[PDB]
Ligand binder design. Structure first.
Ligand SMILES: O=C(O)CCCCCCCCCCCNc1ccc([N+](=O)[O-])c2nonc12
Ligand SMILES: O=C(O)CCCCCCCCCCCNc1ccc([N+](=O)[O-])c2nonc12
Length: 563
């Protein structure tokens, strides 16, 4: 047991050890140069082999925070992450974490042309892929390191199969702009999992987990789900605390376990558990929810009618609420996790109040009646925005929400709002196409992450106490806290693209609603319609920028005159 580097090296392999170590160095020291990290990665990788050969060799006994911190401390003074070294453990590693730059300073990543890129690769495949992990982990310091190993293998395959194609650009770019989209979503989706542990606790995270895993594996018993939750919570605690080697291994041992215990988990993991290691864990995560068992008793007899309701609750409070979550969640694949958790806390309060009572049954009898307005509230919201999407179209719909929510929160920065609206646009596409039954959990997967992305950015750049209240108040009732955000008060002041030529128009309107929030949907559409007539006329004159300058600062006091 003596060595922890060795236990990892043996388990993960030479190739993965090197990689996860590079991800971890880039995640802690984001501003530090590429060539310097590789130097250190190799230094510890060579050292780890030393310990595999002899576990009782010098400094092999040391923990990975003591080891990776020291190596990282070799130049780092860095700047605020300079004093992180003085701290001298467990303060040293704890420092590195709180100091992770979510909103980086780092220069914008500019895509060099196909032939240019295919010759940095091929020639030096090695440092090429090692640059990919370096640049991603830097700009995404909560990016699921084991997931990023799978992304590097998808990036290598898009290059070790496209640079050798008749049409190189048509091969590379549709897969390289897919891989780019898929990783931005994975960083956001994991940054929320982390926030759920850091800003809400182990119990909230574990509750989300019990709900979700119960929805996915309804055939599986309660003791089984509880095993997976316990293991899953371990992987993410480590992965979120920067123990990238430990969790990567624990995610591997869990993928393995699921595959050897399918009978007691699901039927839908057949091909998943035949796939290679990195694909395996990813497969199981994106797997389709299994069928809920045929027959099954009504929750009421076990959580309302039973005399032992307050007995089993006072005895084991968390187990009984876990069983409520498990039993409700598995019967409800149609409900979102967040929703199922509201019903669990709602129930928790009815028990906390009623089991103190002289007649608990006559007190908590009508509890499933508190649940109806809770379920109905989002059910109605989806088949509303879906009707509005089918009506207005992706662009117009986004503009409806952009205006609405800029009026509600002009404090939240313009690009956070434009990006928020553009994620909800995807709810209109991707989620409304689905039938009723699949739509609601589909909806939270873009909302949860976009409200949390907005929340996370609000730490580096705080502007409102009102927003900060929702970003903390509660995990689950975050969505209604933003929906019931009435507003604030009286403290308010040519071509080249098409998809982005829309954002240019969006960011403008967002700012326009920032300035004049009293403007009516009549006024705002009248200005944006006369905006369309500005670009249309000027992109067809034979004195191009002469029209943009003179006829542009012509509607400036025709919009400001429409006040
Ligand atoms: O799923 C993985 O992360 C990779 C593990 C390997 C695959 C195992 C099977 C799938 C388990 C799915 C459950 C994921 N747990 C989660 C907990 C808490 C929050 N939260 O926001 O509070 C989540 N948001 O999205 N997911 C969350
Ligand atoms: O699990 C749950 O019940 C919770 C999610 C249920 C799924 C609901 C899907 C309906 C369509 C919603 C689309 C419009 N809504 C919103 C836009 C913008 C912001 N913003 O703050 O910028 C919002 N905050 O709240 N709602 C927001």
């Amino acid at each position: 047991h003596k060595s922890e580097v060795a236990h990892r090296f043996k388990d993960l392999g030479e190739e993965n050890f090197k990689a996860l170590v590079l991800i971890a160095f880039a995640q802690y020291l984001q501003q530090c140069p590429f060539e310097d990290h590789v130097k250190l990665v190799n230094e510890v990788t060579e050292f780890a082999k030393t310990c595999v050969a002899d576990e009782s060799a010098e400094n092999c006994d040391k923990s990975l925070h003591t080891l990776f911190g020291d190596k990282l401390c070799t130049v780092a003074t860095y700047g605020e992450m300079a004093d992180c070294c003085a701290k001298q453990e467990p303060e040293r590693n704890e420092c590195f974490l709180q100091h992770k730059d979510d909103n980086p300073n780092l220069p914008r990543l500019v895509r060099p042309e196909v032939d240019v890129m295919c010759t940095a690769f091929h020639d030096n495949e090695e440092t090429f892929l090692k640059k990919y992990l370096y640049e991603i982990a830097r700009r995404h310091p909560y990016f699921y390191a084991p997931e990023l190993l799978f992304f590097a293998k998808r990036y290598k395959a898009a290059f070790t199969e496209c640079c050798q194609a008749a049409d190189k650009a048509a091969c590379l770019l549709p897969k390289l702009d897919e891989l780019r989209d898929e990783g931005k979503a994975s960083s956001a989706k994991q940054r929320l999992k982390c926030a759920s542990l850091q800003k809400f606790g182990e119990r909230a995270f574990k509750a989300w987990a019990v709900a979700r895993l119960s929805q996915r594996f309804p055939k599986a018993e309660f003791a089984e789900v509880s095993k997976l939750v316990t293991d899953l919570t371990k992987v993410h605690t480590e992965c979120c605390h920067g123990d990238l080697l430990e969790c990567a291994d624990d995610r591997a041992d869990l993928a393995k376990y699921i595959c050897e215990n399918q009978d007691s988990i699901s039927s839908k993991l057949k091909e998943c558990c035949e796939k290679p290691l990195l694909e395996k864990s990813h497969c199981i995560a994106e797997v389709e929810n299994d069928e809920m068992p045929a027959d099954l008793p009504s929750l009421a007899a076990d959580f309302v009618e039973s005399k032992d309701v307050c007995k089993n609750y006072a005895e084991a409070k968390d187990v009984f609420l876990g069983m409520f979550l498990y039993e409700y969640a598995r019967r409800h694949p149609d409900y979102s996790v967040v929703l199922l958790l509201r019903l669990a806390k709602t129930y928790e309060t009815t028990l906390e109040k009623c089991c103190a009572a002289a007649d608990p049954h006559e007190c908590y009898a009508k509890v499933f009646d508190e649940f109806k307005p809770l379920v109905e509230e989002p059910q109605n919201l989806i088949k509303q925005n879906c009707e509005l999407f089918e009506q207005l179209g992706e662009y117009k719909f986004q503009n409806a929400l952009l205006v609405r929510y800029t009026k509600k929160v002009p404090q939240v920065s313009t690009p956070t709002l434009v990006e928020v609206s553009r994620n909800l646009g995807k709810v209109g596409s991707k989620c409304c196409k689905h039938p009723e039954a699949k739509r609601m959990p589909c909806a939270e997967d873009y909302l949860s992450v976009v409200l949390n992305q907005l929340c996370v950015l609000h730490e580096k750049t705080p502007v409102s106490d009102r927003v900060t209240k929702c970003c903390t108040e509660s995990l689950v009732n975050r969505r209604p806290c933003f929906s019931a955000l009435e507003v604030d008060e009286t403290y308010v002041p040519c071509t080249l693209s098409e998809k982005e030529r829309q954002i240019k128009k969006q960011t403008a309107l967002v700012e326009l609603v920032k300035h004049k929030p009293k403007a009516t949907k009549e006024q705002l559409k009248a200005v944006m319609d006369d905006f369309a007539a500005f670009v249309e006329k000027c992109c067809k004159a034979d004195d191009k920028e002469t029209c943009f300058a003179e006829e542009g600062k012509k509607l400036v006091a025709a919009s400001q005159a429409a006040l």
